[model samples]
Target: LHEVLHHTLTNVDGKAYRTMMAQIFSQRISPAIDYTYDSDILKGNFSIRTAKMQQHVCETIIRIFKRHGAVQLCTPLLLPRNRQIYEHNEAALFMDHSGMLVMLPFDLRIPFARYVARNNILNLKRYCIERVFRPRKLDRFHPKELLECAFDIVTSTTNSFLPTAEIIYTIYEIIQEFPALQERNYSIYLNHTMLLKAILLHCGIPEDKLSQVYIILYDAVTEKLTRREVEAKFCNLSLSSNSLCRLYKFIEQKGDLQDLMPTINSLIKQKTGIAQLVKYGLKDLEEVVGLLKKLGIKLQVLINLGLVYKVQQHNGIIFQFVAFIKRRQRAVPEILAAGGRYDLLIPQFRGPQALGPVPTAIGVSIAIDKISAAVLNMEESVTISSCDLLVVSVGQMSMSRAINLTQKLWTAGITAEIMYDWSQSQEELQEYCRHHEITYVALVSDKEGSHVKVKSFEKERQTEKRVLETELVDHVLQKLRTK
Candidate 1:
């Protein structure tokens, strides 16, 4: 829950005073956990720094997909759940009294499937940068609501792994570009859903029991249950302890995912009943790895069989991007982004099958809140977005001059944060820049020949220059580069 507090500095009796000007409360469509608290207005109030980061991330992915002929989608946040997407999330659902589902989608693929199916679309290279709703969680990632930046590559063909590889490579590229997201960000984990099914089949789990086992494995990791805890729960299914031992052993297996494949291959070899599925699953994963190599991507995308969750909906290669995030809490690798091949996703969408053939698809969603928190903690460049130049007038008399001078930079595509309050003193202006991380402080003063005084913060001992309005844009951009 949050209150939109407007921060301000006022001069009372010739002394600069900082104070909260107003407390504005804006509620979300859904309430936060604490009934007494206000809604978390993420876009503007609590942490505005995250807003800039959210934009940068969305823009990067939108640009990535746009080049591949992807069009932006404008979909409704409210959806009808015929397939029970909300109920599937366990207790993490918010439903209205009218049978209307209030739960934010776990991912965009669900809506996308229904959309494509209903419209009967084609060659769909669709993308979206929207805030997704979730019931909320504890200490994991984004709590109640977070920005989900995603784009799904949908096609009628699955003959090539280009679309799949491209999704992985794009996430890799963006994560690498942001120094905040990478501390060993190169590590990407790959796994196949079919491979999990094959393993269960080999272990003598019945065909009808496979889906139940899959859900249990997924829930175990989601709830962060221990191996013994998981095995105890697996016992409720009345399944084999041998299967449980091997599954836990594989999860605890060391080294890269690809290296561990030889061991899994041997294990599957000894099992006679499910060897065909074993061959297909292993070969499919190998092909994805093969295609990654063929594309000359030097990344070590390890095939971890332990990745058995969220994959039930997927038929082909599933990949996850992890970053070794080092923050005040401690060093830990969190899933910043993940997605993969889901060939049958769009087929059973809400509408009738008259929507025609289901398109093969692959995509990834980035946890924007997590990235924002990480970047704010580690990378300062993200803060540079909003306040490129803080334009301040020397006095109320120079206010009009300040407005025009600020426009000079704005016209050149620079985002110049300006102040209209005419009472602010030079010291007050400096104070604001320090708080806001504004690099260039452009002071417009009619008292000194109408020239602008540019105080650049990142320069050695901070820089001051009296530049004419003509070179203001050129000078500011150049000065920003030096910082």
Candidate 2:
């Protein structure tokens, strides 16, 4: 388990700090675990197995602690890759008859258990966990308790960002229920409620008209309320109350929704018109209906017309602008990494340039697999022998000649490796070299016989004549061995 955690942490960038912090907190908590394990020898005898159970339990506990994100600070540690066994190794070990070894992983299960316990308790105790639940005074109303309760309700409910009507109703209900609040500042509560109601009424949605449009408007208001709540709580914002008031006024003025009756009647008429268009399947009436339905819902509940419009416009503009900036920023870096633009080669070569500014375009591609392999420090090749010589054959007939030559070279006690590919073309062979970023390409032709062609991808192209393949291979080998 420790190895798994370590591997997972190392694989991701910038997670080490978080893992370390978790470890510190975990140590302070000192969580316990009940663990068990089995071994091959223990299974052989029942009596011995029973006695070994205690030892297995102890070993499992230690392993769990090590695995659960606790980095071994001191030496005498047992890393996953270590070949040599240590006497102080804290990991659990099980050996089989064939001498095969196995290790069980461990993790901190206690913190998870505690988290579950806390969640369960909180769920069960939510109603009782109130600010006003004092011990001594059960009869008379306390001003401080009422104040705290009211403050809690406002903080919690307002933070909820319930739609305008719901917010007003919630506050009204809270003020009505609290006897202590009534005794102290009933007038203050009344004034606040009246102000909120006035704002609603000003938006053209009077109490009577609300019932018909309640669900539609509630959904719209709820969406905005939720968004605002997220911004306030998660983003650490405190939006102005006046902003909300202004929004309510804008909705009232624009929609003229003053009373529920007319507004609901209008909504019904609009819905019926939309339904009629949808029934005929005229111009994708279903889509039109869906759009109308959404707008209708929003129109019904939305108390702040200006705020809704501004929110949507701002969201669209900011998101699109940010996306554009990010795309441009990413494009250049991506093209550079992919060894320059190549995808637009055909289009650039064949297409005629348009007039005006004559816009140009190019594309780039990269082998992500190769990049990832290099980053992970992975090696694909294994050395069969420590050779000082290499061989090359250009054609099928040349291959036999190369093999005979290799035999002679082996008899002479010279190390050699012969390249083998009978069906591949010259272009394909060239591509192989390019893929591996190989500098040398040896050619064996009828006229030129056998010669090594050395060309550096990073340097100017130049051809050399009569270069011996063996000598060239020896030089390359020497350079590589030194590195």
Candidate 3:
């Protein structure tokens, strides 16, 4: 039955659809067995399966809402693409132009899951390559050997490029061994790629230069291997020395190094003799060369050495941050929620501003979708707001009094949540409370006046007590402060 559903649902080519169905079914039938959409096309290496999943899921939800009478009142807003359109009488539930269905927890969770899954795969790949390979003594190896080893691990061990059955097993193994990979933010993958590109550009190298460099470096290191070995390993033919030499000549020409040697030699030989040569020829040019060298070193360090530093720094920061928040507070936000302040980003694109004006800051955004999934899978609960007790209102009149009492509660640091749904039945509220595992439910009615009813659902106990609403805050604070 499970295989049949999997086959039927995954038949669609879209990654979004596959992810949507995967998450829905995973949560519904097999919550323990987490599934991820693996593909290279979507942002952060996610597949279009997630998009298709979202469309179908939202369509199903629209049908349900239509049956509920809420959707029928609103006119459908047709979009240019064949995207799904959902309309609710209340704008709160209106989906924007992106076919994103608002106010639907499941709808939000589907794309979010795809995003998280992609990051999970990325972080896993990074951890395996960055962390595990660190002690493997491969850091100083030739770039080609290092690149090939890394590529082999990604391709052979895990289907990082494709969503295959083997990928699931590979990911499971990764998560089991290196738990930190589970906490990685997916956006880092894109940021890393961008940073690499930026570094290459900064070094006066084109974006495509890195790929060409990789090819050259790989060929250089693997030149001793036989044709069969080269084909077996890289699945490509090796370049000859003559071809590499020609490519190197082209690279050197593009770098404008033709007149560099003679110009430097002439300047050095005529140092004190030529005044104009001293002024316009060697010193300034040498300074420029020095600057270029510094930039090259910086770029190389960032791309190779700096990346290693970042991986270590990020891993340590995440571990420490998690520990700090967990110890200091009862509730902690997702690890990826924190972003580093990069005050230099905007100035790079836009020129420097006035001194008094705020400097343009550049910062990378971390995608926490995967971290959120990891947390959810681990059954971690985040307290949105810290509060000891909550008050429930029976009707509109009771709501007014509940509001009045909440103000007093806030002053004494005894927070309280008021149930604003006057139209909802008691059973519905009780079910919500049960799902959240609320310890106490304070029921108040206008007819009861100053008296409030407190029920302990888990304890199966209820009591009627007369209490001053104003003093409730002070009383709870006094009790809690002692502990």
Candidate 4:
């Protein structure tokens, strides 16, 4: 993504470069996609500001994921047809020619699962920052290969609540770092499949038809289908009038766990068939609540039994990270990240222990492009990339000396670079330091060998010192130390 943006901005022709980039507008842009008839392609990595923020966000996120003991991973873009992860209902698949599947991975879990399974990793925590593909928009949704970062935790026998709490803590710590996100109002809503299933069972939903029914409910979230529409589908499923009433009430649940306890307890007593399962789900919920308090997290968290996730593969403790940004006159909420436990998603295995000491997993996927577009400060978030020193030389003899000097500086633990071409004049050569953001410039001239003119460019100061080639490294080191 970074490389594509660099090319888009810097690889234009010398002249007649006022070209209309329609391909980039629609294809390259992610969170701020402009799709109106004449909307300008104004947002993207198309600008240095946006690209740097995206990079910063990615770097910071990767660092935090590492803080939680997650090892970095890179999975393939194209997986085999047989491994196609089918979960969400309206998810369109991408394929290559010759009737073969090209599947630009929409879900990292499948690949990660295959990786862990094949490698026989019994205990693991892994994270990846990359793209996930889809054919086109699902309703109003559009992203460039859906730039996302995901973390997966696999355990051999630890409590499921342990990883779930840690993942939530990881996300909370991140949101806390972004004061803008916190001030603008964001929330982490959680739900567990077992909780939803227990609710369904209590509402008289049949066990044999749970999968089909669960998919319909989960689809309502993504498809943005109305309550009546969902209820209409449920009507066909042989549910009793009493069960349907309970189901509707459950779906319309509002407020936090404390507020909803009366209703929760009432329903458990009213619908007795799912008593044990509901208690189990409640037990998991209570433990998670205890863990959150222990972690000093008092964020806007809600136990949403009414909620549904993107995939049915999510078997336990799923969460949604939403940011409510003040856009124009309205406060709009966007789901920037969502993930949870999907213990049963272990697809394939490998490595030395590929056969034993298995692991159960939970993970979260972050929407990188969306966060950059919505939350990042365009001016403040950009990185100041630079080298410690750059060397420019005149004539073949001078360049030879500059090369030798650069090697010495590097050996002295100084970052240094020599100009790729030495044909430009000294004026332009020195200007390259400022352009490329180098703090110091070593101008090695053909007029002398084993000697250099050291110049510095910094705030409120521009100075020069003539130093012998032999003392060049020592001189620069001293300058850095003094500065």
Per-candidate TM equals 0.78, 0.21, 0.31, 0.73
lDDT at 319, model 2: 6
Off by over 4 Å in 3: 1-211, 215-367, 379-388, 395-399, 410-415, 420-426, 446-449, 458-466, 479-483
Query: Over the stretch 191-288, how does candidate 2's per-residue lDDT look in tens digits?
Result: 11122233344444446743323233334543545646533442232334554454343345322223333432332243444334323322222232
Write model 1 residue lDDT over 272-383, tens digit each, in one string: 5557667777777777777777877655677677776476677877777765655678876678777877767665664643735566777788776776666677635545
Could you give candidate 4's per-residue lDDT for residues 376-415 as a string of tens digits? 6544443444567788877776767778878878888988
TM-score (C-alpha) between model 1 and the true structure: 0.78
Candidate 4: deviation at residue 369, Å? 2.7
Q: After aligning candidate 1 to the native by TM-score, how far in Å is the CA of 120 from where it should be?
A: 0.9
User: Candidate 4: what lDDT?
Assistant: 0.71
The lDDT ranking, best first, is 4, 1, 3, 2
Computed on alpha carbons, the lDDT of every model, listed in order, comes to 0.68, 0.33, 0.36, 0.71
Quote model 3's TM-score: 0.31
Q: Which residue pairs of candidate 1 clash?
A: 1-38, 257-303
Better of 1 and 4 by lDDT: 4
